Amino acid sequence: SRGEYVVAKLDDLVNWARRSSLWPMTFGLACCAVEMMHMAAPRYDMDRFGVVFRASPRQSDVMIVAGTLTNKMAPALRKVYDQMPEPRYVVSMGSCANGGGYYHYSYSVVRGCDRIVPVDIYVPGCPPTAEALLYGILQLQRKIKREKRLRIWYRR
Amino acid sequence: LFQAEKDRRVLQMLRENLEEEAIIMKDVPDWKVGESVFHTTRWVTPMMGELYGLRTNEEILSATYGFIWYT
Amino acid sequence: MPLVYMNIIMAFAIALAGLLMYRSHLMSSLLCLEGMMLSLFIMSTLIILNTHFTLANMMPIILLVFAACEAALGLSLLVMVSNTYGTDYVQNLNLLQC
Amino acid sequence: PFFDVQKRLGLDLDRWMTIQSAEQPHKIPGRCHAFEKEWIECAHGIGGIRAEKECKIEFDDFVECLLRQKTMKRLSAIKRQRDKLIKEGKYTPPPHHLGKEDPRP
Amino acid sequence: MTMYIAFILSTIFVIGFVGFSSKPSPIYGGLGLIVSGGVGCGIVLNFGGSFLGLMVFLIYLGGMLVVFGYTTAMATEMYPEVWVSNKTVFGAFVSGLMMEFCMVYYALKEEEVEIIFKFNGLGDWVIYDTGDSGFFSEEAMGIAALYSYGTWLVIVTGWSLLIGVVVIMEITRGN
Amino acid sequence: MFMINILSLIIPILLAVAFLTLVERKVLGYMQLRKGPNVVGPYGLLQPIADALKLFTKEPLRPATSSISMFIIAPILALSLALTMWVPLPMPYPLINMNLGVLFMLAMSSLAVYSILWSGWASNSKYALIGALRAVAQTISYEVTLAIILLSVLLMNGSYTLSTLITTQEHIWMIFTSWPLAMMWFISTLAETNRAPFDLTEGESELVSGFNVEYAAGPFAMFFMAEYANIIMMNAFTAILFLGASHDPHTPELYTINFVLKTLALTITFLWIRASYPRFRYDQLMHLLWKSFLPLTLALCMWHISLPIMTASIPPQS
Amino acid sequence: MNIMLTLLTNVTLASLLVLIAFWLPQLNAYSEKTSPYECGFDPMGSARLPFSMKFFLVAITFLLFDLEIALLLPLPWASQTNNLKTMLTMALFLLILLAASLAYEWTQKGLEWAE
Amino acid sequence: AGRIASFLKNAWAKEPVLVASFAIGGLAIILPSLSPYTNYAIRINRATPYNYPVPLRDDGNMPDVPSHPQDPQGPSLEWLKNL
Amino acid sequence: MWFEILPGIAVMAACLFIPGMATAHIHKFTNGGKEKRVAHFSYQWNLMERDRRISGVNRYHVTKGLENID
Numbered sequence A: 001s002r003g004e005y006v007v008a009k010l011d012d013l014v015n016w017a018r019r020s021s022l023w024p025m026t027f028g029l030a031c032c033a034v035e036m037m038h039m040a041a042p043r044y045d046m047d048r049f050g051v052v053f054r055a056s057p058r059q060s061d062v063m064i065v066a067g068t069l070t071n072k073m074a075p076a077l078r079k080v081y082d083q084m085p086e087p088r089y090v091v092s093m094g095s096c097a098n099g100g101g102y103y104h105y106s107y108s109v110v111r112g113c114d115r116i117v118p119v120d121i122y123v124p125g126c127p128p129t130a131e132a133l134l135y136g137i138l139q140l141q142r143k144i145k146r147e148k149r150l151r152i153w154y155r156r
Numbered sequence B: 001l002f003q004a005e006k007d008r009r010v011l012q013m014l015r016e017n018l019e020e021e022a023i024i025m026k027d028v029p030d031w032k033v034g035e036s037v038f039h040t041t042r043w044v045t046p047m048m049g050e051l052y053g054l055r056t057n058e059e060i061l062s063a064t065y066g067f068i069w070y071t
Numbered sequence C: 001m002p003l004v005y006m007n008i009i010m011a012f013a014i015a016l017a018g019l020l021m022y023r024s025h026l027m028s029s030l031l032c033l034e035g036m037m038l039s040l041f042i043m044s045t046l047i048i049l050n051t052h053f054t055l056a057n058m059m060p061i062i063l064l065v066f067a068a069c070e071a072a073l074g075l076s077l078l079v080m081v082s083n084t085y086g087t088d089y090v091q092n093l094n095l096l097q098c
Numbered sequence D: 001p002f003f004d005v006q007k008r009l010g011l012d013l014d015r016w017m018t019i020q021s022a023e024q025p026h027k028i029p030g031r032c033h034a035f036e037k038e039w040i041e042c043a044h045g046i047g048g049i050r051a052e053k054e055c056k057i058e059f060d061d062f063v064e065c066l067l068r069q070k071t072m073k074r075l076s077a078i079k080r081q082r083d084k085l086i087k088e089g090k091y092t093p094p095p096h097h098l099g100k101e102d103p104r105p
Numbered sequence E: 001m002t003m004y005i006a007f008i009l010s011t012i013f014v015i016g017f018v019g020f021s022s023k024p025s026p027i028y029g030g031l032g033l034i035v036s037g038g039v040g041c042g043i044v045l046n047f048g049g050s051f052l053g054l055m056v057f058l059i060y061l062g063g064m065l066v067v068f069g070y071t072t073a074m075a076t077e078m079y080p081e082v083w084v085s086n087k088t089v090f091g092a093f094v095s096g097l098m099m100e101f102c103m104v105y106y107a108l109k110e111e112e113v114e115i116i117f118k119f120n121g122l123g124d125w126v127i128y129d130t131g132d133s134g135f136f137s138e139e140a141m142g143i144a145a146l147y148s149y150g151t152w153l154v155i156v157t158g159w160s161l162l163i164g165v166v167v168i169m170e171i172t173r174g175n
Numbered sequence F: 001m002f003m004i005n006i007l008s009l010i011i012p013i014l015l016a017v018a019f020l021t022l023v024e025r026k027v028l029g030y031m032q033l034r035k036g037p038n039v040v041g042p043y044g045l046l047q048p049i050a051d052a053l054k055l056f057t058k059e060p061l062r063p064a065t066s067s068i069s070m071f072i073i074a075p076i077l078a079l080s081l082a083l084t085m086w087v088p089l090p091m092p093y094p095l096i097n098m099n100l101g102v103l104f105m106l107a108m109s110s111l112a113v114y115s116i117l118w119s120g121w122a123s124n125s126k127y128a129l130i131g132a133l134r135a136v137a138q139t140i141s142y143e144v145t146l147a148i149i150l151l152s153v154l155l156m157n158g159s160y161t162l163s164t165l166i167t168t169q170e171h172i173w174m175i176f177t178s179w180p181l182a183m184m185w186f187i188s189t190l191a192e193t194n195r196a197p198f199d200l201t202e203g204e205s206e207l208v209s210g211f212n213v214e215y216a217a218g219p220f221a222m223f224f225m226a227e228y229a230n231i232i233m234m235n236a237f238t239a240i241l242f243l244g245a246s247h248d249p250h251t252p253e254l255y256t257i258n259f260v261l262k263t264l265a266l267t268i269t270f271l272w273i274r275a276s277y278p279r280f281r282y283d284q285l286m287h288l289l290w291k292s293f294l295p296l297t298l299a300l301c302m303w304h305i306s307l308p309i310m311t312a313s314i315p316p317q318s
Numbered sequence G: 001m002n003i004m005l006t007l008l009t010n011v012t013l014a015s016l017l018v019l020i021a022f023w024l025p026q027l028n029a030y031s032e033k034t035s036p037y038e039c040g041f042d043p044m045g046s047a048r049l050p051f052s053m054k055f056f057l058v059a060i061t062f063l064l065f066d067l068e069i070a071l072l073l074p075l076p077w078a079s080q081t082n083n084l085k086t087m088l089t090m091a092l093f094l095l096i097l098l099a100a101s102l103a104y105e106w107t108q109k110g111l112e113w114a115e
Numbered sequence H: 001a002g003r004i005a006s007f008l009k010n011a012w013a014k015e016p017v018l019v020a021s022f023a024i025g026g027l028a029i030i031l032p033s034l035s036p037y038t039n040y041a042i043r044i045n046r047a048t049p050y051n052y053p054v055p056l057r058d059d060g061n062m063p064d065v066p067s068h069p070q071d072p073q074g075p076s077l078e079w080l081k082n083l
Numbered sequence I: 001m002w003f004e005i006l007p008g009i010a011v012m013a014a015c016l017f018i019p020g021m022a023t024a025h026i027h028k029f030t031n032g033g034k035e036k037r038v039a040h041f042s043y044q045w046n047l048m049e050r051d052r053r054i055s056g057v058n059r060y061h062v063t064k065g066l067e068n069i070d
């Protein structure tokens, strides 16, 4: 159908635009963030993929939880996630963000950031190498490429 | 040459206005055609309204705002 | 007189009435003073341009200069008023009566 | 009240700007130079009380040049009668008053 | 008669004066004064005063900016007022608008002496001079002439500005 | 036909602005021992298009405490003034030929500052307020010295008309006669466009995002467009003012190429300076402009008033 | 005439860009998303509370200094008069007074910000 | 002598900007009164014909007034060509 | 690479090439193939109005030479 072709092409264009321009929030918590700093270092150069850190949550598209989420911090993380305009994505990095990790059985640690916010990609490691985080980011790009919002709307 | 041409053009426009006004204001009982509003009889520089009063809008705009709006 | 002269005179009158009728803040009265200065500038400039009074062309500029002084003066006073009360309200200036 | 220091010392502090017929830059004339010149020459040396009476014609001409009230009244009357005549069709404007004039340099 | 641009500009001038004269929060008063300054600059440009109009507009921007800073510092409230957030401000705004409309309507529909004298209208274009000469600007020449002709004005203005600096520094001392 | 000219001015400036963002990213990357955008399209040529489409397909949100009218108005004012600033510039023929082009440009710049002030105040946030007050301080710092430098430079031109600057610099660039003021002027433009080392209104490392912290998607993109358009405009103005390109009336394309190359060089210099220096403190900026730049500016204004009279080199066209 | 058309075109394009930005994407606004931003937490006080300006004296002086620029703007045109001696004397006098005001404020700690 | 030398050395070492500003300002103030070309600038300004030269009515008693632009009488700008 | 910065820069150059040249062409196209007349003062405007008046077509850029004085 003509409308089917039109919505497919529009979905392709929008997905390409969104995945080719990913702006994660300047937001890190612990050791994992250091590896994130090494992903912006010249050797890997995430900016060459169109990935740019931005401090304002209103101007960010992705949240990379790189570190341990404590009970004292969980409201702040949820607050800065809610203030992100949509569409928005979350990447969980390291053991601490994935499931608590080395501090799983602590009284002051959230046993996984997915109890607070939904998570799209889980990057394992303590800490994951900057190459592993880059692989996770590219996997998120592929996941965005698979999105079919306009087709679903048209088929409604 | 420009001064002479300007003088002739202004006088010609004034005479055209005067003749047309003589045609229009004939029915008015106590209207003098070409009556000055000044006691002095010396030549008074014509106002823009006198020269372009009975003409089209475009000519008035060009005479008034033509130079200021030209960019 | 053209209608533009009437409009500018009415602007000056409106600004004067706004200054003379006081609300709480003082900065609003200072702004009304600035508006009166602006209206005076516009009126004088229109008259001078229409009349082709060449040497009078510098008159509006001088006006603006003293406007600045007036504005500066007012702002200075406002500072002290705030420093005494924490607000620029005019109802705090009632220590002296008639 | 008025200490005329300028006249005593021949200083000319602000008299160069008081009137519109007083040595403008580049000899650029005022719009009503002749009328104001005539009024000033009429009223000179005879005092304000006498000048208000014996120089009223020149002052009236100067005011008419400044504000052009009577000229606007005359033009308004002419235009109103033109509109009245045109509406019922007794008068038609000539081609040179409708934009079809043969222009001249 | 021709496009009545100057009349519309002067009406916006009056509208801005009403806007900042009803005295809302000083932020909106400054906005209204900026609008009025720009529109008056447009009017003066339309009547041939490019430098003066540009200069007044240039002077007001920054003066208002200084005011914006001063309003944020010592002239703020928890809920700043706008022209629709208060009965007094809205009433003053509406009264100013209706008075301007009444003045205009009594002006263009008949010849009546409102305050000073009467007026008929017919656009500003009637009062022009059709002067045809010059490789210069008359306004520029007059403004340029202040140094050569107005030696006294320069002296008094410079003294006033220096004394104004001294005066502001004296006033804001405190103690 | 004039509307076609307006469009032919507006659209290439926007396209140029988008491409400037890509050029800045790559220049910063290569100065930082990395590459910059090279994946989205060949040599990252499609990156600005992806950025724009992503920004304008994202939801813009109105803050609960914001004043909606000023919040919406401020980006419109910023972008409209940024586009308006380009109309009197002669390349070598201006779209609008003004007798006082420099003064109109000065007035327009003053208007641009208000958009930053209005957006910061209407955001109704603490960081936005800090950014707005920093903008106020910056304008107070630079405005007077910028105007006096412009007057001193134009004293050699004879008039405020922009196109006459082409005639004044027929044989030598004006910088050779005013290289001190020029340097000051350059720094002033850095302060004026809120560029590093004077990016105090945004202040990412201090104020998160400054005045545009609450803005998202399209309004934020419009603020970005206005900033980069102002950057290119100011570099073009500096190129016209101090680096006078030769103009052949029968072949204006030569002047166009020369002018564009000079503006590109100055913009790349801006990017270089951003990549080279730390950030000032916003009181240190005012102290620098008032205690160092202003005495020299006054002295050079005196010198440049006296110089044509001393040497009998007063320019024509009173 | 042309300048009004240019300004209208610029404003119209900016407003159309705003309209496209606000009407094309899908909006899901809830109270938590639109809350004020203070990097992790609810703000303590209002952002409309008074914010002390420590450079108020320099701000006031800028008003006077700004006025000085207007006097200086006419200088290029003025440099064309026949009595160049008087014009040069007046220009130097005005600049000297500006420098003197700057020096007076500088020496009496007027350019130093409040503590 | 020594006192002002020490003062100038201290100013040059500590505030060179103010030293340069005062030097340039003093030069701008004092130099034009010593220049021989200022009168040439005044004459160049005087010689620019902004407005029309209105002719005089001949009365038979004007030996120094030319009857034509190309007559030897009247001001000449041979000096301006060689300047 | 460093020369990989050159493509994008070149693109910007092309963009900045468009406005000025465009203006020039349009001015010539609407001005009769010659540069649009500049009227900064009233005398130049009066000259342009005189050319428009004597053109016989109501176009200032239509020039009448010695062939019109018979």
Ligand SMILES: CCCCCCCCCCCCCCCCC[C@@H](O)O[C@H](CO[C@H](O)CCCCCCCCCCCCCCC)COP(=O)(O)OCC[N+](C)(C)C
Pocket: A009, A010, A012, A013, A016, F039, F046, F049, F053
């Ligand atoms: C006109 C002004 C208003 C509209 C503004 C929009 C401007 C026009 C949009 C420009 C379109 C260009 C985008 C196309 C780039 C695609 C690049 C290509 O590589 O995409 C591939 C396939 O393409 C995508 O599947 C779809 C993109 C094509 C979009 C369809 C065309 C629709 C155009 C309709 C235009 C209408 C605009 C709206 C007007 C109202 C997938 O590759 P990718 O995975 O990335 O790269 C892998 C990285 N590796 C190689 C290193 C491993």
Ligand SMILES: CCCCCCCCCCCCCCCCC[C@@H](O)O[C@H](CO[C@H](O)CCCCCCCCCCCCCCC)COP(=O)(O)OCC[N+](C)(C)C
Pocket: D013, D023, E148, E149, E151, E152, E155, E159, G083, G086, G089, G093
């Ligand atoms: C009686 C006691 C005197 C001393 C104290 C009096 C206090 C008042 C301040 C100064 C007195 C006013 C006198 C100045 C009058 C100005 C006009 C006069 O000087 O002529 C000018 C001569 O110019 C002189 O150079 C004036 C310079 C004197 C003023 C500069 C310094 C003095 C002021 C210092 C005090 C002010 C405040 C303190 C600031 C530090 C212009 O003449 P010229 O241009 O040929 O021809 C004009 C006619 N044209 C246009 C047709 C061609």
Ligand SMILES: CCCCCCCCCCCCCCCCC[C@@H](O)O[C@H](CO[C@H](O)CCCCCCCCCCCCCCC)COP(=O)(O)OCC[N+](C)(C)C
Pocket: G016, G019, G020, G023, G024, G025, G026, G027
């Ligand atoms: C860059 C320069 C070039 C740009 C050129 C394009 C400019 C376009 C301006 C903006 C329009 C595009 C934005 C998106 C398309 C418009 C659709 C929307 O805005 O209008 C809808 C209109 O809906 C109306 O409320 C009801 C529809 C009926 C309208 C009544 C008008 C009379 C029609 C009756 C039938 C007779 C036909 C007569 C027509 C000739 C409201 O939908 P809404 O959900 O809020 O918005 C969410 C949109 N989402 C879903 C994509 C996120």
Ligand SMILES: CCCCCCCC/C=C\CCCCCCCC(=O)O[C@H](COC(=O)CCCCCCC/C=C/CCCCCCCC)COP(=O)(O)OCCN
Pocket: F180, F181, F182, F183, F184, F186, F187, F197, F238, F242, F273, F277, F288, F292, F293, F296, F303, H014, H015, H016, H017, H020, H024
């Ligand atoms: C024969 C008659 C001649 C008349 C005399 C003329 C000769 C003049 C001699 C001196 C001229 C020098 C002018 C310099 C202007 C001011 C310089 C200055 O002193 O400012 C510095 C500061 O200047 C800066 O650091 C600049 C800050 C921002 C720098 C960012 C850019 C750096 C350079 C990039 C390239 C510059 C390109 C310039 C030209 C560009 C092309 C237009 C003061 O800083 P402090 O050391 O802290 O001193 C204060 C305490 N005393």
Ligand SMILES: CCCCCCCC/C=C\CCCCCCCC(=O)O[C@H](COC(=O)CCCCCCC/C=C/CCCCCCCC)COP(=O)(O)OCCN
Pocket: F291, F294, F295, F296, F298, F299, F302, G096, G099, G100, G102, G103, G106, G107, H008, H011, H014, H015, H018, H019, H021, H022, H023, H024, H025, H026
């Ligand atoms: C005669 C020409 C005059 C006209 C032209 C002048 C143009 C503009 C220059 C004047 C502007 C105002 C200058 C005011 C100077 C005030 C100095 C001052 O008080 O500041 C001192 C610093 O300056 C001093 O030390 C006092 C003055 C020292 C000498 C300054 C120059 C004086 C004249 C020297 C040059 C003489 C002429 C040049 C000859 C060159 C050799 C041939 C304190 O510095 P802070 O910023 O507070 O320190 C903060 C960090 N801790």
Ligand SMILES: CCCCCCCCCCC1=C(C)C(=O)C(OC)=C(OC)C1=O
Pocket: A026, A027, A028, A029, A030, A031, A032, A033, A034, A036, A037, A040, A053
């Ligand atoms: C643009 C250059 C790379 C930017 C990297 C941004 C990293 C943001 C995380 C914040 C953070 C910072 C700044 C930081 O400095 C730090 O070390 C103590 C952290 O702990 C590991 C952090 O989490």
Ligand code: SF4
Pocket: A030, A031, A032, A033, A066, A067, A068, A093, A094, A095, A096, A097, A101, A102, A125, A126, A127
């Ligand atoms: S997962 Fe390991 S490296 Fe990452 S924050 Fe936790 S303890 Fe540190």
